[PDB]
Design a protein around this ligand. Structure first.
Ligand SMILES: CCCCCCCCCCCC(=O)O
Ligand SMILES: CCCCCCCCCCCC(=O)O
Ligand SMILES: [Cl-]
Ligand SMILES: [Cl-]
Lengths: 155, 155
């Protein structure tokens, strides 16, 4: 869709803790319920020495907040990773300063998130998020407060 | 919250057909499911000679798309109406050109909609909607395509 990627991305520097501060998707049903397919809350990024990205996340599964670990395998493009699915899906990093915020989208139909390092509404990062979204066909946008950010599955 | 109201509002001129093109709310759960409390789709406005506003809407009730009629009673302020509830709730008209778009919010916790006259994504009206929202503490925003606009309960 989806032509904002980060130049010069250093994947090692996105390691560590993240909070899904805001989420957006092209279909309401991708994000509408707690158990909706793309309602996933990022907990931690672990880039591997190969330069694959391991993702720890929470997803509300059947009546509970399950912890999931997913591998995004690297591509020829440093800002684009691949997740193995049914068929499968690209993760693109649009923008990050490493230390405060990271924007990314998953496509294939589309969902994007604004990730932040701390449980804080980051006005700057949310501006960047909305700007990157105005380019995209989004029909639902969610945002979470600092209290929900400290809760499992933002409950 | 909620300090954008329309000056010189002529309530007779909002009569007729409307489409809820976009919705936003301060709590995700006010809009998340089809049966969520403020997921209501405006069908028609009928101002009465007294200057009360009769509202025809659809709401997804128990497994189906119910038609509801609600009366918003006028106040001293032309752009502000009152709905009788458990306790009760103000409707404010923020902005309208009568002929294309109308923005309104309901408060008491808060939901706003961008209404349009035709089943068309109105880029102008959506700009106005987002501008009026940046002032407000919104955590979910929904938008509907022209196909869903022609469907009962936007299904
Ligand atoms: C910088 C990469 C950000 C992490 C991308 C998250 C991808 C999650 C894909 C969701 C699939 C699933 O959980 O079933
Ligand atoms: C210009 C006025 C726009 C109409 C305002 C809609 C108010 C709907 C309130 C929802 C309450 C309910 O349906 O139970
Ligand atoms: Cl939908
Ligand atoms: Cl919530």
């Amino acid at each position: 869709i989806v032509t904002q990627t980060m130049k010069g991305l250093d994947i090692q520097k996105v390691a560590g803790t993240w909070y899904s501060l805001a989420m957006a998707a092209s279909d309401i049903s991708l994000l509408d319920a707690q158990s909706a397919p793309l309602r996933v809350y990022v907990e931690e990024l672990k880039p591997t020495p190969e330069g694959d990205l391991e993702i720890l996340l929470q997803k509300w599964e059947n009546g509970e907040c399950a912890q999931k670990k997913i591998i995004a395998e690297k591509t020829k493009i440093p800002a684009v990773f691949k997740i193995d699915a049914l068929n499968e899906n690209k993760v693109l990093v649009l923008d990050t300063d490493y230390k405060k915020y990271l924007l990314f989208c998953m496509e294939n139909s589309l969902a994007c998130q604004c990730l932040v390092r701390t449980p804080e509404v980051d006005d700057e990062a949310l501006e960047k998020f909305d700007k990157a979204l105005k380019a995209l066909p989004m029909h639902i946008r969610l945002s979470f407060n600092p209290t929900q950010l400290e809760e499992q599955c933002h409950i």
